[PDB]
Design a protein around this nucleic acid. Structure first.
Length: 267
DNA sequence: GCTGATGCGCCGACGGATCC
DNA sequence: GGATCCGTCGATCGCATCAGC
């Protein structure tokens, strides 16, 4: 069954209008994604903040298009030290603080009224050869997130590399031993929401909506059949739920095997 | 400088067995 | 004997290095 995202709800349930638009995208390689017109999609979406994962591109190699972004001119990049991984954070307004780590996987940006964490969570790998690291990472991430000095509410977004529940992927039965849908990963997502605490923005608004995916394997034309996974999230502190207008899956924006996701907050 | 081979990280389809 | 459950296998992309001209 295919899916079409409901229209954009730009007003919080109390009736206040959105004032912050946040977009997150695993881009499957930034230089490729630019060549496939992904920057055209960003300009059409006009986010206040743009979070990229899997840039596979060090800063000296960022295409020049990236300094032709005047609405997103405060840019911060993090790649591993040892053409793989990599994350990026672009913002209309300069943040108050920017830090990296908890690897080239996490950027922390403090804005006026909240703290944005974008994350590219390590993959448990084919055959699960990296699942134990993932579980160790999950726990270090959690403890890092909880221990964020600021009393400001938390926005965490990006590629979290797990389909939380069976509703979040097409083939839950046959993927229960596969990376991204192990009991160990699902449990990890569960602990994060309660430990921190955090809420799954998309399902707080659409708790029963099936077939909403942010990832489709390139193989076997899985995207055309909407055979996919929900691997990309916005996660909110409980106090930011009143200001939550909508959380979107931009299924039609091409350029990666991940699609963009977008958050509308009313601050 | 540029190309192509190769290596690496990143499951849906399919075949066979069991169950009522 | 249709439905379901289980294990096996081939395979998309982007980017790196390496070899050659």
């Amino acid at each position: 069954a295919l899916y079409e995202d409901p229209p954009d709800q730009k007003t919080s349930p109390s009736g206040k209008p959105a004032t912050l638009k946040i977009c997150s995208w695993n881009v499957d390689g930034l230089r490729a994604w630019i060549k496939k017109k992904g920057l055209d999609w960003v300009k059409e979406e006009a986010p206040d903040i743009l979070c990229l994962q899997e840039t596979k591109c060090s800063e000296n190699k960022l295409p020049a298009e990236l300094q032709e972004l005047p609405g997103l001119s405060h840019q911060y990049w993090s790649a591993p030290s040892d053409g793989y991984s990599g994350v990026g954070l672009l913002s209309r307004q300069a943040p108050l603080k920017v830090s990296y780590g908890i690897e080239g996987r996490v950027i922390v940006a403090e804005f006026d009224s909240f703290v944005l964490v974008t994350a590219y969570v390590p993959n448990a790998g084919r055959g699960l050869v990296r699942l134990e690291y993932r579980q160790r990472w999950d726990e270090a991430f959690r403890k890092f997130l909880k221990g964020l000095a600021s009393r400001k509410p938390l926005v965490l977004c990006g590629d979290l590399n797990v389909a939380h529940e069976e509703i979040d992927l097409r083939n839950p039965k046959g993927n229960k031993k596969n990376a991204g849908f192990t009991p160990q990963e699902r449990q990890g997502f569960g602990e994060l929401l309660q430990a921190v605490p955090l809420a799954d923005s998309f399902r707080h608004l659409y708790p029963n909506t099936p077939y909403a995916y942010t990832f489709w394997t390139y193989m076997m034309n899985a995207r055309s059949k909407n055979v996919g996974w929900r691997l990309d999230y916005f996660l909110l502190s409980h106090s930011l739920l009143p200001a939550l207008c909508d959380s979107k899956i931009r299924s039609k924006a091409l350029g990666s095997d991940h699609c963009p996701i977008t958050l509308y907050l009313a601050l």
